[PDB]
């Protein structure tokens, strides 16, 4: 008999109260019980005596983590989906210069959100740049490329380079001629 | 809605695209409803004044 708990601050308290019938519907559909506490700001999920997927309870743990980290409900359920995962990526501990750090992550998110929407769409992922952390949910490959790209952008390679690299790799994979080559003569 | 969104992200800090001082922040809601054909970029009377 297993369970997990995680904590939310007050604004997410508001939206969580708003959505709670939905998360209980979904965890009902998978036969997992969940409880919301407004006094301790707490959120618990627990296994039943009729459930048969402790993998799904692990999923639900990561679910509630995402909800408290404030991605909305449709993305919550898309993480409860089978072949998906979310990932916390630390980017606080790279640049000593405060303004340089702030500037570099601003470059990551890109003007008018252009860079963010572009990389998200290419990777089928969903990305939330949270202060000194980055959260990424999606299919496993998508997370892999996202982690590499965000790390280089915290480093000193422009995501503009990375988006072009992803696009070229995308076309190369799309055309099924070269299934065993280096491709380095293609990539920039 | 834009005030709600800025307050949302700012208050749970999610770094955003730096909008100018004048215009309206651009979001998926305005991309999808195609509102600026009817409202505009920003209030040009205030911009000229």
């Amino acid at each position: 008999e297993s369970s997990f708990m995680t904590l939310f601050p007050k604004y997410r308290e508001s939206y969580l109260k708003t959505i709670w019938n939905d998360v209980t519907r979904a965890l009902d559909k998978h036969n997992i019980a969940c409880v919301l506490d407004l006094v301790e700001g707490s959120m618990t999920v627990k296994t039943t005596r009729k459930t048969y997927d402790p993998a799904i309870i692990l999923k639900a743990r990561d679910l509630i983590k995402l909800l408290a980290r404030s991605v909305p409900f449709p993305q919550a359920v898309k993480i409860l989906q089978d072949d998906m995962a979310c990932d916390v990526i630390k980017i606080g501990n790279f640049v000593t210069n405060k303004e340089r750090f702030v500037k570099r992550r601003q470059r990551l998110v890109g003007p008018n959100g252009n860079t963010l929407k572009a990389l998200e769409l290419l990777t089928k992922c969903y990305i939330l740049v949270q202060g000194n952390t980055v959260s990424a949910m999606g299919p496993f490959k998508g997370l892999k490329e996202v982690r590499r790209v965000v790390e280089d952008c915290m480093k000193n390679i422009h995501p503009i380079y990375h988006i072009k690299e992803l696009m070229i790799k995308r076309e190369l994979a799309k055309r099924p001629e070269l299934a065993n080559e280096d491709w380095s003569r293609f990539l920039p | 809605r834009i005030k709600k969104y800025e307050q949302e992200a700012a208050e749970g800090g999610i770094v955003l695209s730096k909008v100018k001082k004048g215009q309206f922040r651009k979001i998926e809601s305005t991309y999808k409803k195609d509102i600026e054909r009817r409202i505009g970029g920003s209030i040009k009377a205030r911009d000229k004044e």
Binding site: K117, L121, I163, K164, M167 | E28, Y31
Partner: peptide, 25 residues
């Protein structure tokens, strides 16, 4: 910066995303 298809994909990224309901060629 002086590339032409990439910049175009960026500036159209939002449109494609909110009108898919991937294609950018």
């Amino acid at each position: 910066q002086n590339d032409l298809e990439l910049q175009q994909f960026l500036r159209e990224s939002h449109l494609l995303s909110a009108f898919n309901n991937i294609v950018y060629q």
